[PDB]
Design an enzyme around this catalytic site. Structure first.
Site, short mmCIF file in Angstrom:
data_model
loop_
_atom_site.label_atom_id
_atom_site.label_comp_id
_atom_site.label_asym_id
_atom_site.label_seq_id
_atom_site.Cartn_x
_atom_site.Cartn_y
_atom_site.Cartn_z
N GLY A 182 0.82 -1.20 0.00
CA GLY A 182 0.00 0.00 0.00
C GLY A 182 0.87 1.27 0.00
N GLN B 199 2.84 10.06 2.08
CA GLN B 199 4.16 9.42 2.01
C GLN B 199 4.96 9.90 0.75
OE1 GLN B 199 2.21 5.39 2.85
NE2 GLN B 199 4.17 5.04 3.92
N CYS C 255 6.10 -0.17 7.82
CA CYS C 255 5.68 1.00 7.09
C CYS C 255 6.86 1.51 6.25
CB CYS C 255 5.21 2.11 8.07
SG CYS C 255 4.71 3.71 7.25
N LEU C 256 6.59 1.86 4.98
CA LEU C 256 7.64 2.37 4.11
C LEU C 256 8.25 3.66 4.59
CD1 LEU C 256 6.24 1.32 0.60
CD2 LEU C 256 8.19 0.33 1.90
N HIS D 9 -4.31 0.85 7.56
CA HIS D 9 -3.01 1.46 7.69
C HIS D 9 -2.93 2.68 6.78
CE1 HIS D 9 1.53 1.00 8.13
NE2 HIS D 9 1.49 1.73 7.03
N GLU D 10 -3.36 2.56 5.51
CA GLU D 10 -3.32 3.71 4.57
C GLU D 10 -4.29 4.81 5.00
OE1 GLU D 10 -0.95 3.71 2.55
OE2 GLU D 10 -0.56 1.58 2.83
N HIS E 244 -2.86 6.98 7.56
CA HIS E 244 -1.92 7.95 6.95
C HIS E 244 -2.61 9.20 6.44
CE1 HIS E 244 2.14 6.38 6.81
NE2 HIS E 244 1.72 5.21 6.35
C1 LIG Z 1 0.46 -4.59 6.72
C2 LIG Z 1 -0.09 -3.21 6.83
C3 LIG Z 1 0.02 -2.40 5.55
C4 LIG Z 1 1.39 -2.08 5.24
C5 LIG Z 1 1.54 -1.03 4.12
C6 LIG Z 1 3.09 -0.80 4.03
C7 LIG Z 1 3.36 0.37 2.97
C8 LIG Z 1 2.97 1.67 3.68
O1 LIG Z 1 3.78 2.12 4.46
N1 LIG Z 1 1.78 2.25 3.48
O2 LIG Z 1 1.47 3.29 4.08
C9 LIG Z 1 3.70 -2.14 3.63
O3 LIG Z 1 3.56 -2.57 2.51
N2 LIG Z 1 4.41 -2.77 4.61
C10 LIG Z 1 5.12 -4.02 4.48
C11 LIG Z 1 4.58 -4.94 5.61
O4 LIG Z 1 4.28 -4.44 6.71
N3 LIG Z 1 4.43 -6.27 5.38
C12 LIG Z 1 4.74 -7.01 4.12
C13 LIG Z 1 4.38 -8.43 4.45
C14 LIG Z 1 3.43 -8.37 5.60
C15 LIG Z 1 3.91 -7.18 6.41
C16 LIG Z 1 4.96 -7.60 7.40
O5 LIG Z 1 5.19 -6.75 8.29
C17 LIG Z 1 6.65 -3.90 4.48
C18 LIG Z 1 7.07 -3.29 3.16
C19 LIG Z 1 7.14 -3.07 5.60
NI NI Z 2 2.71 3.27 6.09
#
Ligand SMILES: CCCCC[C@H](CC(=O)NO)C(=O)N[C@H](C(=O)N1CCC[C@H]1CO)C(C)C
Ligand code: NI
Length: 151
Positions: free
Chosen positions: A46, A51, A90-91, A132-133, A136
């Protein structure tokens, strides 16, 4: 397309609640297109407009192929049911992961690129990403909801 720079937490734009989108224009379309590829290139499921430095209520999620990308504009959560606990990152906080409790089922009302209002229902991981989004878009970071960070 452009690979937008993802804003990291060292930054005030991340806690600034976003304004609603009013003009559903070409620039909004380009924003969404750039966000989706930028997100995917960075391995996110997401991404929210703040961001990438834009304080508009715009976000996109893409957690599965079948479902596919789901662009959300001016989203609001109309209902929530049940709860789920799990790991989130979170990115904007590279390397940081914590346990977070969110609603399991959610019903969301949002607008597409043309401003038409749709209704979406989600659950499990897709519902987590969406919440989560949406957080934000209101200047809320997951850090405020972490139960514990993992070791
Ligand atoms: C899960 C809640 C939504 C997360 C969205 C984030 C991207 C983001 O920061 N959006 O605002 C993401 O992809 N996060 C990933 C993430 O949290 N993941 C990817 C696999 C499942 C989970 C593990 O923590 C990684 C890139 C940090
Ligand atoms: Ni995030």
């Amino acid at each position: 397309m452009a690979v937008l720079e993802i804003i990291k937490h060292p930054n005030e734009v991340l806690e600034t609640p976003c304004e609603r989108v009013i003009n559903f224009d070409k620039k909004l379309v380009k924003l969404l297109k750039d966000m989706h590829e930028t997100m995917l290139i960075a391995d996110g499921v997401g991404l929210a407009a703040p961001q990438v430095g834009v304080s508009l209520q715009v976000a996109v999620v893409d957690v599965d192929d079948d479902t596919g990308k789901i662009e959300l504009i001016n989203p609001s959560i109309l209902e929530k049911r049940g709860e789920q606990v799990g790991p989130e990152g979170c990115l904007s906080f590279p390397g940081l992961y914590g346990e977070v409790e969110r609603a399991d089922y959610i019903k969301v009302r949002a607008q597409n690129r043309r401003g038409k209002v749709f209704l979406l229902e989600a659950e499990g991981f897709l519902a987590r990403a969406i919440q989560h989004e949406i957080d934000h878009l209101h200047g809320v970071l997951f850090t405020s909801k972490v139960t514990r960070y993992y070791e």
